[PDB]
Amino acid sequence: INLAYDDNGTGDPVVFIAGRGGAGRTWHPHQVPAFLAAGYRCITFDNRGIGATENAEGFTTQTMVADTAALIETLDIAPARVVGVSMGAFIAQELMVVAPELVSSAVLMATRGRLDRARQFFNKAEAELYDSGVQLPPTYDARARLLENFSRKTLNDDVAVGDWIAMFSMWPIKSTPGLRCQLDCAPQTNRLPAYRNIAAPVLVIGFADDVVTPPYLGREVADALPNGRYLQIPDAGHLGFFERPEAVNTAMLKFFASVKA
Amino acid sequence: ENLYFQGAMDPEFRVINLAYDDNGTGDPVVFIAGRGGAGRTWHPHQVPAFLAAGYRCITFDNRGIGATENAEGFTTQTMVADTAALIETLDIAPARVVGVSMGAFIAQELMVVAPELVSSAVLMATRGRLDRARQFFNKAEAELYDSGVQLPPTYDARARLLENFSRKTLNDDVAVGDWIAMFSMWPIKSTPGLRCQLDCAPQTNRLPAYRNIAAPVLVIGFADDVVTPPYLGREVADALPNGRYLQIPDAGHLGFFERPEAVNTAMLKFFASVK
Ligand code: NA
Protein backbone atom coordinates (compact mmCIF):
# COMPACT_ATOMS: atom_id res chain seq x y z
CA ILE A 1 0.00 0.00 0.00
CA ASN A 2 0.95 3.60 -0.49
CA LEU A 3 0.35 5.70 2.66
CA ALA A 4 -0.99 9.23 3.08
CA TYR A 5 1.86 11.72 3.23
CA ASP A 6 2.42 15.47 3.44
CA ASP A 7 5.14 17.29 1.52
CA ASN A 8 6.23 20.86 2.41
CA GLY A 9 8.89 23.25 1.15
CA THR A 10 11.90 22.84 -1.02
CA GLY A 11 15.45 21.89 -0.09
CA ASP A 12 17.32 19.15 1.74
CA PRO A 13 14.67 16.58 2.50
CA VAL A 14 13.88 15.46 6.08
CA VAL A 15 11.42 12.55 6.66
CA PHE A 16 9.65 12.43 10.05
CA ILE A 17 8.52 9.02 11.41
CA ALA A 18 5.96 9.25 14.25
CA GLY A 19 5.58 6.92 17.26
CA ARG A 20 2.87 4.28 17.96
CA GLY A 21 -0.57 5.74 17.50
CA GLY A 22 0.73 9.00 15.99
CA ALA A 23 -0.12 10.44 12.60
CA GLY A 24 2.09 12.57 10.38
CA ARG A 25 0.06 15.45 11.88
CA THR A 26 2.01 15.04 15.12
CA TRP A 27 5.00 16.80 13.55
CA HIS A 28 3.15 19.90 12.36
CA PRO A 29 2.37 21.91 15.50
CA HIS A 30 5.97 22.15 16.63
CA GLN A 31 8.51 20.59 14.24
CA VAL A 32 7.61 21.30 10.62
CA PRO A 33 7.39 25.12 10.81
CA ALA A 34 10.77 25.40 12.51
CA PHE A 35 12.38 23.09 9.94
CA LEU A 36 10.80 24.99 7.06
CA ALA A 37 12.13 28.32 8.41
CA ALA A 38 15.55 26.73 8.46
CA GLY A 39 15.24 25.86 4.76
CA TYR A 40 14.47 22.13 4.86
CA ARG A 41 11.83 20.23 2.96
CA CYS A 42 9.62 18.17 5.37
CA ILE A 43 7.85 14.94 4.71
CA THR A 44 5.39 13.51 7.19
CA PHE A 45 3.17 10.56 6.65
CA ASP A 46 0.79 8.12 8.33
CA ASN A 47 2.51 4.90 9.46
CA ARG A 48 0.82 1.68 8.63
CA GLY A 49 -1.78 0.93 11.30
CA ILE A 50 -2.83 4.60 11.38
CA GLY A 51 -5.66 6.56 9.72
CA ALA A 52 -6.66 5.02 6.35
CA THR A 53 -4.87 1.82 7.47
CA GLU A 54 -6.08 1.49 11.05
CA ASN A 55 -7.48 -1.99 10.38
CA ALA A 56 -4.23 -3.26 8.99
CA GLU A 57 -3.01 -6.24 11.11
CA GLY A 58 -0.31 -8.88 10.76
CA PHE A 59 2.34 -6.31 9.68
CA THR A 60 5.80 -6.23 11.36
CA THR A 61 8.73 -3.83 11.84
CA GLN A 62 10.07 -5.10 8.58
CA THR A 63 6.85 -4.09 6.68
CA MET A 64 7.14 -0.72 8.32
CA VAL A 65 10.76 -0.29 7.30
CA ALA A 66 9.85 -1.12 3.66
CA ASP A 67 6.95 1.38 3.72
CA THR A 68 9.43 4.09 4.78
CA ALA A 69 11.97 2.95 2.13
CA ALA A 70 9.24 2.96 -0.58
CA LEU A 71 8.28 6.48 0.47
CA ILE A 72 11.87 7.69 0.28
CA GLU A 73 12.14 6.12 -3.20
CA THR A 74 8.72 7.10 -4.51
CA LEU A 75 9.62 10.77 -3.84
CA ASP A 76 13.18 10.47 -5.19
CA ILE A 77 14.73 12.02 -2.03
CA ALA A 78 17.35 9.38 -1.29
CA PRO A 79 19.38 9.89 0.85
CA ALA A 80 17.17 11.86 3.22
CA ARG A 81 17.72 13.16 6.71
CA VAL A 82 15.41 11.16 9.06
CA VAL A 83 13.81 12.25 12.35
CA GLY A 84 12.04 9.51 14.32
CA VAL A 85 10.52 9.19 17.78
CA SER A 86 10.03 5.86 19.72
CA MET A 87 8.58 3.25 17.41
CA GLY A 88 9.63 5.79 14.78
CA ALA A 89 13.18 5.84 16.07
CA PHE A 90 13.13 2.06 16.02
CA ILE A 91 11.91 2.06 12.41
CA ALA A 92 14.67 4.64 11.51
CA GLN A 93 17.30 2.47 13.22
CA GLU A 94 16.24 -0.61 11.32
CA LEU A 95 16.08 1.21 7.98
CA MET A 96 19.62 2.26 8.43
CA VAL A 97 20.51 -1.36 9.05
CA VAL A 98 19.04 -2.84 5.81
CA ALA A 99 19.23 0.26 3.57
CA PRO A 100 22.00 2.59 4.79
CA GLU A 101 22.04 4.29 1.37
CA LEU A 102 18.57 5.75 1.94
CA VAL A 103 19.63 7.91 4.96
CA SER A 104 22.26 10.61 5.26
CA SER A 105 21.77 11.29 8.96
CA ALA A 106 19.20 10.84 11.63
CA VAL A 107 17.80 12.16 14.92
CA LEU A 108 16.32 9.42 17.11
CA MET A 109 14.29 10.52 20.16
CA ALA A 110 13.21 8.30 23.03
CA THR A 111 14.61 5.17 21.59
CA ARG A 112 16.05 1.85 22.67
CA GLY A 113 17.85 -1.05 21.01
CA ARG A 114 16.91 -4.20 22.91
CA LEU A 115 13.95 -5.76 24.73
CA ASP A 116 14.63 -4.34 28.22
CA ARG A 117 12.32 -4.89 31.14
CA ALA A 118 10.54 -1.55 30.98
CA ARG A 119 9.51 -2.44 27.42
CA GLN A 120 8.34 -5.97 28.45
CA PHE A 121 6.24 -4.60 31.29
CA PHE A 122 4.64 -2.15 28.90
CA ASN A 123 4.17 -4.77 26.16
CA LYS A 124 2.37 -7.01 28.66
CA ALA A 125 0.24 -4.31 30.27
CA GLU A 126 -0.86 -2.82 26.88
CA ALA A 127 -1.57 -6.20 25.23
CA GLU A 128 -3.61 -7.26 28.22
CA LEU A 129 -5.56 -4.06 28.21
CA TYR A 130 -6.57 -4.69 24.57
CA ASP A 131 -7.50 -8.37 24.92
CA SER A 132 -9.63 -7.70 28.03
CA GLY A 133 -11.83 -5.44 25.87
CA VAL A 134 -11.97 -2.97 28.80
CA GLN A 135 -12.73 0.72 28.07
CA LEU A 136 -11.06 3.10 30.60
CA PRO A 137 -13.34 6.02 31.32
CA PRO A 138 -12.07 9.24 29.62
CA THR A 139 -10.83 11.12 32.77
CA TYR A 140 -8.91 8.04 34.04
CA ASP A 141 -7.54 7.60 30.49
CA ALA A 142 -6.50 11.34 30.33
CA ARG A 143 -4.81 10.85 33.68
CA ALA A 144 -2.76 7.93 32.42
CA ARG A 145 -1.70 10.00 29.35
CA LEU A 146 -0.71 12.83 31.59
CA LEU A 147 1.47 10.66 33.91
CA GLU A 148 2.88 8.58 31.04
CA ASN A 149 3.99 11.51 28.93
CA PHE A 150 5.05 14.63 30.84
CA SER A 151 7.76 15.91 33.12
CA ARG A 152 7.21 16.68 36.83
CA LYS A 153 7.84 20.32 36.01
CA THR A 154 4.86 20.25 33.64
CA LEU A 155 2.43 18.58 35.96
CA ASN A 156 3.21 21.29 38.64
CA ASP A 157 2.03 23.90 36.22
CA ASP A 158 -1.67 24.64 36.40
CA VAL A 159 -1.99 26.35 33.02
CA ALA A 160 -0.10 23.68 31.10
CA VAL A 161 -2.12 20.85 32.67
CA GLY A 162 -5.35 22.53 31.69
CA ASP A 163 -3.93 22.73 28.14
CA TRP A 164 -2.65 19.17 28.02
CA ILE A 165 -6.00 17.94 29.31
CA ALA A 166 -7.83 20.09 26.65
CA MET A 167 -5.36 18.99 23.96
CA PHE A 168 -6.32 15.36 24.62
CA SER A 169 -9.73 15.97 23.01
CA MET A 170 -8.08 17.22 19.83
CA TRP A 171 -5.90 14.10 19.78
CA PRO A 172 -8.31 11.23 20.29
CA ILE A 173 -6.41 7.87 20.27
CA LYS A 174 -8.74 5.13 19.06
CA SER A 175 -7.97 1.55 20.02
CA THR A 176 -7.70 -0.25 16.72
CA PRO A 177 -6.29 -3.50 15.28
CA GLY A 178 -3.59 -1.29 13.79
CA LEU A 179 -2.77 0.22 17.13
CA ARG A 180 -2.51 -3.25 18.62
CA CYS A 181 -0.26 -4.49 15.88
CA GLN A 182 2.13 -1.48 16.27
CA LEU A 183 2.65 -2.75 19.76
CA ASP A 184 4.74 -5.58 18.16
CA CYS A 185 7.03 -3.20 16.13
CA ALA A 186 9.63 -2.97 18.88
CA PRO A 187 12.99 -4.64 19.47
CA GLN A 188 12.56 -8.36 20.26
CA THR A 189 16.26 -9.10 20.50
CA ASN A 190 19.55 -7.24 21.18
CA ARG A 191 19.88 -4.92 18.21
CA LEU A 192 22.94 -3.03 19.43
CA PRO A 193 25.37 -5.45 17.63
CA ALA A 194 23.61 -4.81 14.34
CA TYR A 195 23.82 -1.06 15.04
CA ARG A 196 27.62 -1.05 15.20
CA ASN A 197 27.60 -1.26 11.37
CA ILE A 198 25.77 2.02 10.80
CA ALA A 199 28.04 4.68 9.21
CA ALA A 200 25.72 7.69 9.16
CA PRO A 201 25.95 10.50 11.70
CA VAL A 202 23.15 10.12 14.27
CA LEU A 203 21.94 12.21 17.20
CA VAL A 204 20.14 10.35 20.04
CA ILE A 205 17.92 12.52 22.25
CA GLY A 206 16.82 11.20 25.65
CA PHE A 207 14.18 12.91 27.61
CA ALA A 208 15.15 13.19 31.36
CA ASP A 209 11.73 12.35 32.87
CA ASP A 210 10.85 9.68 30.29
CA VAL A 211 9.32 6.55 31.89
CA VAL A 212 8.03 4.77 28.85
CA THR A 213 11.56 4.80 27.25
CA PRO A 214 14.03 5.94 29.92
CA PRO A 215 17.04 8.01 28.81
CA TYR A 216 19.71 5.46 29.67
CA LEU A 217 18.43 3.21 26.86
CA GLY A 218 19.13 5.97 24.39
CA ARG A 219 22.73 6.26 25.72
CA GLU A 220 23.06 2.60 24.79
CA VAL A 221 22.00 3.19 21.14
CA ALA A 222 24.33 6.23 20.97
CA ASP A 223 27.25 4.01 22.22
CA ALA A 224 26.54 1.22 19.75
CA LEU A 225 26.47 3.70 16.82
CA PRO A 226 30.04 4.48 15.51
CA ASN A 227 28.89 8.03 14.61
CA GLY A 228 26.26 8.37 17.23
CA ARG A 229 26.23 10.78 20.10
CA TYR A 230 23.70 11.25 22.85
CA LEU A 231 21.97 14.30 24.12
CA GLN A 232 19.67 14.68 27.13
CA ILE A 233 16.78 17.16 27.53
CA PRO A 234 16.00 18.08 31.16
CA ASP A 235 12.38 18.31 32.28
CA ALA A 236 10.82 16.43 29.36
CA GLY A 237 8.54 13.46 29.41
CA HIS A 238 8.16 10.88 26.72
CA LEU A 239 6.51 13.62 24.57
CA GLY A 240 9.58 15.79 25.01
CA PHE A 241 9.39 17.12 21.45
CA PHE A 242 5.91 18.46 22.07
CA GLU A 243 6.64 19.74 25.56
CA ARG A 244 9.99 21.33 25.04
CA PRO A 245 9.93 22.19 21.30
CA GLU A 246 12.45 24.96 21.38
CA ALA A 247 15.07 22.97 23.21
CA VAL A 248 14.41 19.95 21.04
CA ASN A 249 14.35 21.78 17.67
CA THR A 250 17.53 23.78 18.40
CA ALA A 251 19.31 20.53 19.06
CA MET A 252 18.08 18.77 15.94
CA LEU A 253 18.80 21.83 13.84
CA LYS A 254 22.31 22.50 15.19
CA PHE A 255 23.02 18.84 14.53
CA PHE A 256 21.57 18.77 10.98
CA ALA A 257 23.35 21.95 10.01
CA SER A 258 26.62 20.34 11.01
CA VAL A 259 26.38 17.42 8.62
CA LYS A 260 26.20 17.18 4.85
CA ALA A 261 22.98 16.35 2.90
CA GLU B 1 -3.70 -9.29 71.35
CA ASN B 2 -6.72 -7.59 69.71
CA LEU B 3 -7.30 -4.10 70.83
CA TYR B 4 -10.24 -1.90 69.72
CA PHE B 5 -11.28 1.63 70.37
CA GLN B 6 -14.50 3.37 69.71
CA GLY B 7 -14.54 5.62 66.64
CA ALA B 8 -16.51 8.86 66.25
CA MET B 9 -20.19 8.70 65.35
CA ASP B 10 -20.50 8.97 61.58
CA PRO B 11 -22.86 11.24 59.65
CA GLU B 12 -25.29 8.34 59.28
CA PHE B 13 -25.37 8.12 63.11
CA ARG B 14 -23.42 4.86 63.46
CA VAL B 15 -20.64 4.14 65.90
CA ILE B 16 -18.02 1.52 64.88
CA ASN B 17 -14.93 0.05 66.50
CA LEU B 18 -11.46 0.40 64.89
CA ALA B 19 -8.48 -1.89 65.51
CA TYR B 20 -5.24 -0.63 66.97
CA ASP B 21 -1.80 -1.96 68.07
CA ASP B 22 0.26 -0.64 70.99
CA ASN B 23 3.94 -1.43 71.49
CA GLY B 24 6.60 -0.17 73.88
CA THR B 25 6.52 1.86 77.02
CA GLY B 26 8.28 4.99 75.88
CA ASP B 27 7.21 8.40 74.57
CA PRO B 28 4.00 7.73 72.63
CA VAL B 29 3.90 8.19 68.90
CA VAL B 30 0.59 7.86 66.94
CA PHE B 31 1.13 6.73 63.26
CA ILE B 32 -1.50 7.53 60.69
CA ALA B 33 -1.28 5.62 57.44
CA GLY B 34 -2.32 6.91 54.05
CA ARG B 35 -5.24 5.98 51.84
CA GLY B 36 -5.43 2.21 51.42
CA GLY B 37 -2.87 1.49 54.18
CA ALA B 38 -3.50 -0.57 57.36
CA GLY B 39 -1.67 0.20 60.59
CA ARG B 40 0.57 -2.76 59.77
CA THR B 41 2.29 -0.76 57.00
CA TRP B 42 4.40 1.02 59.64
CA HIS B 43 5.63 -2.25 61.14
CA PRO B 44 8.34 -3.17 58.62
CA HIS B 45 10.46 0.04 58.65
CA GLN B 46 9.12 2.54 61.21
CA VAL B 47 8.03 0.72 64.38
CA PRO B 48 11.32 -1.24 64.97
CA ALA B 49 13.40 1.95 64.68
CA PHE B 50 11.09 3.87 67.03
CA LEU B 51 11.01 1.07 69.63
CA ALA B 52 14.77 0.87 69.57
CA ALA B 53 14.78 4.66 70.25
CA GLY B 54 12.50 4.35 73.30
CA TYR B 55 9.26 5.46 71.67
CA ARG B 56 5.98 3.72 72.23
CA CYS B 57 4.19 3.26 68.84
CA ILE B 58 0.47 3.23 68.28
CA THR B 59 -0.72 2.13 64.87
CA PHE B 60 -4.25 1.53 63.73
CA ASP B 61 -6.64 0.73 60.93
CA ASN B 62 -8.27 3.93 59.62
CA ARG B 63 -11.94 3.76 58.91
CA GLY B 64 -12.55 2.17 55.57
CA ILE B 65 -9.67 -0.28 56.04
CA GLY B 66 -9.52 -3.94 57.09
CA ALA B 67 -12.47 -4.73 59.34
CA THR B 68 -14.29 -1.53 58.29
CA GLU B 69 -13.57 -1.86 54.64
CA ASN B 70 -17.33 -1.59 53.90
CA ALA B 71 -17.66 1.70 55.80
CA GLU B 72 -18.91 4.52 53.64
CA GLY B 73 -20.48 7.96 54.13
CA PHE B 74 -17.60 9.38 56.26
CA THR B 75 -15.56 12.49 55.76
CA THR B 76 -12.28 13.97 56.85
CA GLN B 77 -13.96 15.22 60.08
CA THR B 78 -14.98 11.67 60.91
CA MET B 79 -11.37 10.47 60.66
CA VAL B 80 -10.00 13.40 62.59
CA ALA B 81 -12.58 12.67 65.31
CA ASP B 82 -11.50 8.97 65.25
CA THR B 83 -7.88 9.98 65.76
CA ALA B 84 -8.78 12.20 68.61
CA ALA B 85 -10.75 9.38 70.10
CA LEU B 86 -7.72 7.09 69.98
CA ILE B 87 -5.62 9.75 71.68
CA GLU B 88 -8.20 10.41 74.39
CA THR B 89 -8.69 6.68 74.98
CA LEU B 90 -5.02 5.93 75.64
CA ASP B 91 -4.94 9.08 77.64
CA ILE B 92 -1.74 10.25 75.85
CA ALA B 93 -2.59 13.86 75.00
CA PRO B 94 -0.66 15.81 73.83
CA ALA B 95 0.87 13.09 71.54
CA ARG B 96 3.60 12.92 68.98
CA VAL B 97 2.03 12.21 65.55
CA VAL B 98 3.45 10.82 62.30
CA GLY B 99 1.17 10.92 59.18
CA VAL B 100 1.77 10.07 55.51
CA SER B 101 -0.45 11.48 52.70
CA MET B 102 -4.13 11.11 53.66
CA GLY B 103 -2.86 10.45 57.15
CA ALA B 104 -0.76 13.62 57.09
CA PHE B 105 -3.84 15.47 56.02
CA ILE B 106 -5.84 13.99 58.94
CA ALA B 107 -3.02 15.09 61.30
CA GLN B 108 -3.11 18.60 59.85
CA GLU B 109 -6.85 18.85 60.38
CA LEU B 110 -6.57 17.37 63.88
CA MET B 111 -4.06 20.06 64.78
CA VAL B 112 -6.39 22.77 63.41
CA VAL B 113 -9.33 21.75 65.62
CA ALA B 114 -7.66 19.96 68.62
CA PRO B 115 -4.25 21.38 69.04
CA GLU B 116 -3.94 20.25 72.69
CA LEU B 117 -3.98 16.56 71.57
CA VAL B 118 -0.80 16.87 69.51
CA SER B 119 2.64 17.98 70.73
CA SER B 120 4.59 17.74 67.48
CA ALA B 121 4.15 16.17 64.14
CA VAL B 122 5.97 14.76 61.10
CA LEU B 123 3.94 15.05 57.92
CA MET B 124 5.22 13.02 54.89
CA ALA B 125 4.13 13.48 51.32
CA THR B 126 1.55 16.07 52.06
CA ARG B 127 -0.36 19.07 50.77
CA GLY B 128 -2.93 21.50 52.07
CA ARG B 129 -4.71 22.02 48.77
CA LEU B 130 -5.24 20.07 45.54
CA ASP B 131 -3.61 21.68 42.46
CA ARG B 132 -5.01 21.25 38.94
CA ALA B 133 -3.33 17.90 38.23
CA ARG B 134 -3.99 16.44 41.66
CA GLN B 135 -7.70 17.57 41.55
CA PHE B 136 -7.91 15.84 38.23
CA PHE B 137 -6.26 12.65 39.51
CA ASN B 138 -8.75 12.52 42.31
CA LYS B 139 -11.67 12.94 39.89
CA ALA B 140 -10.18 10.27 37.55
CA GLU B 141 -9.84 7.78 40.38
CA ALA B 142 -13.42 8.49 41.57
CA GLU B 143 -14.72 8.01 38.00
CA LEU B 144 -12.93 4.66 37.67
CA TYR B 145 -14.49 3.30 40.79
CA ASP B 146 -17.92 4.68 40.05
CA SER B 147 -17.92 3.22 36.54
CA GLY B 148 -17.53 -0.41 37.77
CA VAL B 149 -14.71 -1.12 35.36
CA GLN B 150 -11.95 -3.40 36.74
CA LEU B 151 -8.31 -2.84 35.59
CA PRO B 152 -6.60 -5.92 34.22
CA PRO B 153 -3.96 -7.23 36.66
CA THR B 154 -0.77 -6.39 34.71
CA TYR B 155 -1.87 -2.89 33.79
CA ASP B 156 -2.78 -2.37 37.43
CA ALA B 157 0.62 -3.49 38.64
CA ARG B 158 2.50 -1.27 36.19
CA ALA B 159 0.46 1.79 37.16
CA ARG B 160 1.07 1.09 40.85
CA LEU B 161 4.78 0.80 40.20
CA LEU B 162 5.13 4.06 38.26
CA GLU B 163 2.99 6.11 40.62
CA ASN B 164 4.93 5.16 43.74
CA PHE B 165 8.56 4.76 43.11
CA SER B 166 11.61 6.86 42.23
CA ARG B 167 13.39 6.80 38.90
CA LYS B 168 16.32 5.33 40.66
CA THR B 169 14.23 2.27 41.76
CA LEU B 170 12.41 2.14 38.48
CA ASN B 171 15.72 1.86 36.51
CA ASP B 172 17.01 -0.97 38.67
CA ASP B 173 15.51 -4.23 37.41
CA VAL B 174 16.25 -6.38 40.38
CA ALA B 175 14.59 -3.77 42.66
CA VAL B 176 11.51 -3.61 40.40
CA GLY B 177 11.25 -7.44 40.62
CA ASP B 178 11.32 -7.16 44.39
CA TRP B 179 8.54 -4.59 44.64
CA ILE B 180 6.21 -6.25 42.22
CA ALA B 181 6.51 -9.48 44.22
CA MET B 182 5.78 -7.41 47.34
CA PHE B 183 2.62 -6.05 45.64
CA SER B 184 1.25 -9.49 45.82
CA MET B 185 1.80 -9.47 49.59
CA TRP B 186 0.17 -6.02 50.01
CA PRO B 187 -2.77 -6.35 47.60
CA ILE B 188 -4.93 -3.14 47.55
CA LYS B 189 -8.52 -4.33 47.70
CA SER B 190 -11.09 -2.09 45.92
CA THR B 191 -13.76 -1.33 48.49
CA PRO B 192 -16.45 1.18 49.49
CA GLY B 193 -13.97 2.20 52.21
CA LEU B 194 -11.22 3.01 49.72
CA ARG B 195 -13.58 4.98 47.57
CA CYS B 196 -14.69 7.03 50.52
CA GLN B 197 -11.08 7.68 51.63
CA LEU B 198 -10.69 9.40 48.28
CA ASP B 199 -12.70 12.33 49.58
CA CYS B 200 -10.65 12.90 52.74
CA ALA B 201 -8.54 15.40 50.80
CA PRO B 202 -8.64 19.17 50.73
CA GLN B 203 -11.74 20.32 48.85
CA THR B 204 -10.66 23.93 49.47
CA ASN B 205 -7.35 25.62 50.24
CA ARG B 206 -6.51 24.82 53.91
CA LEU B 207 -3.18 26.54 53.96
CA PRO B 208 -4.68 29.65 55.67
CA ALA B 209 -6.10 27.51 58.50
CA TYR B 210 -2.63 25.97 59.02
CA ARG B 211 -1.29 29.38 59.80
CA ASN B 212 -2.58 29.16 63.35
CA ILE B 213 -0.95 25.89 64.20
CA ALA B 214 1.67 26.48 66.86
CA ALA B 215 3.07 22.92 67.33
CA PRO B 216 6.60 22.17 65.95
CA VAL B 217 6.21 20.31 62.67
CA LEU B 218 8.56 18.55 60.19
CA VAL B 219 7.18 18.22 56.66
CA ILE B 220 9.03 15.65 54.44
CA GLY B 221 8.62 15.74 50.66
CA PHE B 222 9.89 12.96 48.42
CA ALA B 223 11.63 14.25 45.36
CA ASP B 224 10.10 11.88 42.83
CA ASP B 225 6.57 11.83 44.29
CA VAL B 226 3.98 12.63 41.63
CA VAL B 227 0.85 11.75 43.66
CA THR B 228 1.77 14.57 45.99
CA PRO B 229 4.63 16.69 44.60
CA PRO B 230 7.24 18.07 46.98
CA TYR B 231 6.25 21.70 46.30
CA LEU B 232 2.79 21.14 47.83
CA GLY B 233 4.44 19.83 50.96
CA ARG B 234 6.74 22.79 51.06
CA GLU B 235 3.70 25.08 50.90
CA VAL B 236 2.43 23.36 53.99
CA ALA B 237 5.74 23.95 55.87
CA ASP B 238 5.68 27.61 54.77
CA ALA B 239 2.20 27.99 56.18
CA LEU B 240 3.02 26.46 59.57
CA PRO B 241 4.70 29.05 61.92
CA ASN B 242 6.95 26.37 63.35
CA GLY B 243 7.09 24.00 60.39
CA ARG B 244 10.34 23.18 58.61
CA TYR B 245 10.79 21.35 55.27
CA LEU B 246 13.06 18.47 54.35
CA GLN B 247 13.37 16.76 51.04
CA ILE B 248 14.48 13.11 50.56
CA PRO B 249 16.22 12.65 47.20
CA ASP B 250 15.37 9.55 45.09
CA ALA B 251 12.14 8.80 46.93
CA GLY B 252 8.80 8.24 45.24
CA HIS B 253 5.36 8.56 46.84
CA LEU B 254 6.28 5.66 49.10
CA GLY B 255 9.60 7.27 50.33
CA PHE B 256 9.16 6.00 53.91
CA PHE B 257 9.19 2.46 52.62
CA GLU B 258 11.84 2.89 49.89
CA ARG B 259 14.35 5.04 51.81
CA PRO B 260 13.49 4.05 55.39
CA GLU B 261 16.90 4.87 56.85
CA ALA B 262 16.94 8.49 55.49
CA VAL B 263 13.32 9.03 56.56
CA ASN B 264 13.81 7.44 59.98
CA THR B 265 17.00 9.35 60.77
CA ALA B 266 15.30 12.61 59.93
CA MET B 267 12.21 11.89 62.07
CA LEU B 268 14.23 10.70 65.13
CA LYS B 269 16.48 13.76 64.85
CA PHE B 270 13.42 16.01 64.66
CA PHE B 271 11.61 14.33 67.67
CA ALA B 272 14.70 14.58 69.95
CA SER B 273 14.59 18.51 69.76
CA VAL B 274 10.85 19.42 69.84
CA LYS B 275 8.93 22.12 71.75
NA1 NA C 1 7.22 27.92 58.42
Side-chain angles (χ1 to χ4, degrees), chain A residues 60-106:
Chain A
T60 67
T61 300
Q62 174 222 287
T63 319
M64 282 176 106
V65 168
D67 291 339
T68 318
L71 190 78
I72 280 171
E73 280 147 353
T74 291
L75 300 166
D76 186 43
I77 56 173
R81 297 178 159 84
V82 168
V83 169
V85 67
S86 263
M87 183 181 80
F90 180 59
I91 299 167
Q93 282 166 206
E94 293 301 324
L95 175 67
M96 281 172 122
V97 162
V98 268
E101 75 276 4
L102 266 18
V103 176
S104 32
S105 57

Side-chain angles (χ1 to χ4, degrees), chain B residues 187-204:
Chain B
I188 301 299
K189 190 206 203 320
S190 201
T191 66
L194 197 68
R195 164 71 181 76
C196 206
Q197 297 198 329
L198 208 63
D199 304 316
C200 314
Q203 320 277 189
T204 45

Side-chain angles (χ1 to χ4, degrees), chain A residues 61-249:
Chain A
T61 300
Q62 174 222 287
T63 319
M64 282 176 106
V65 168
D67 291 339
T68 318
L71 190 78
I72 280 171
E73 280 147 353
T74 291
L75 300 166
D76 186 43
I77 56 173
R81 297 178 159 84
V82 168
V83 169
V85 67
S86 263
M87 183 181 80
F90 180 59
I91 299 167
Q93 282 166 206
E94 293 301 324
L95 175 67
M96 281 172 122
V97 162
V98 268
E101 75 276 4
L102 266 18
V103 176
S104 32
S105 57
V107 175
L108 315 155
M109 292 167 329
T111 201
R112 52 164 60 76
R114 54 181 181 92
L115 182 42
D116 53 289
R117 287 274 181 78
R119 182 69 198 213
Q120 304 154 216
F121 203 174
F122 171 95
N123 280 348
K124 262 132 179 131
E126 278 301 279
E128 203 197 27
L129 189 69
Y130 178 83
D131 296 330
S132 95
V134 144
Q135 271 288 286
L136 306 176
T139 314
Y140 186 86
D141 200 20
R143 179 195 178 257
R145 288 166 78 176
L146 237 6
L147 299 157
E148 229 82 62
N149 290 311
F150 298 95
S151 64
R152 290 167 300 213
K153 170 157 208 230
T154 289
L155 303 174
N156 299 349
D157 190 323
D158 271 53
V159 170
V161 164
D163 289 346
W164 300 122
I165 289 149
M167 204 64 85
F168 296 153
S169 305
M170 320 205 236
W171 298 83
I173 291 189
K174 179 163 80 170
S175 176
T176 61
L179 188 77
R180 167 61 183 90
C181 184
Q182 288 188 346
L183 194 58
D184 297 333
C185 307
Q188 331 241 52
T189 66
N190 203 18
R191 295 303 286 160
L192 309 175
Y195 298 164
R196 295 207 194 86
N197 298 127
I198 293 157
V202 170
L203 176 65
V204 188
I205 306 190
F207 304 122
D209 290 3
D210 195 331
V211 293
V212 184
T213 308
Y216 84 94
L217 281 158
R219 276 154 189 307
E220 287 173 15
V221 175
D223 291 62
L225 289 147
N227 293 290
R229 93 289 327 262
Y230 172 84
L231 180 62
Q232 187 160 301
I233 318 292
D235 298 315
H238 196 54
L239 295 182
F241 60 101
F242 240 69
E243 184 185 3
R244 307 287 165 212
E246 322 74 14
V248 178
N249 296 330

Side-chain angles (χ1 to χ4, degrees), chain B residues 104-125:
Chain B
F105 178 60
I106 288 154
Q108 280 153 205
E109 299 298 315
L110 167 67
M111 301 187 283
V112 163
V113 328
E116 71 287 356
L117 304 184
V118 180
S119 70
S120 43
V122 170
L123 304 176
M124 301 178 292

